[PDB]
Each structure stands twice: as C-alpha cells, then as structure tokens.
Design a protein around this ligand. Structure first.
Ligand SMILES: *C(=O)/C=C/CCCCCCCCCC(C)C
Ligand SMILES: CC(C)=CCC/C(C)=C/COP(=O)(O)O
Ligand SMILES: [Ca+2]
Ligand SMILES: [Ca+2]
Length: 11
C-alpha cells in the first residue's frame, strides 16, 4: 500500500 490511506485510494 501507499499514501497512508490503506489499500487503493492514493497510491
Ligand atoms: C501495498 O499495496 C503493498 C503491496 C505489496 C506488493 C507490492 C508489489 C511488489 C511486486 C512488484 C513487481 C513489479 C513488476 C516486476 C514490474
Ligand atoms: C512506490 C510508489 C512509487 C508508489 C506505488 C507502489 C504501490 C505498491 C502501490 C499500491 O498502493 P495502493 O494500495 O495504495 O494503491
Ligand atoms: Ca495495496
Ligand atoms: Ca493507498
């Protein structure tokens, strides 16, 4: 995951 928002959303 990326983004610090978990899976998907912001990469
Ligand atoms: C968050 O989504 C983390 C997920 C773990 C998987 C990451 C992808 C690893 C493999 C990438 C392979 C790239 C190819 C060879 C272009
Ligand atoms: C490492 C970089 C440059 C960004 C994306 C790499 C990746 C593993 C994406 C998956 O993240 P999500 O689950 O947040 O979509
Ligand atoms: Ca992911
Ligand atoms: Ca994300």
């Amino acid at each position: 995951d990326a983004x610090d928002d978990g899976d998907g959303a912001i990469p």
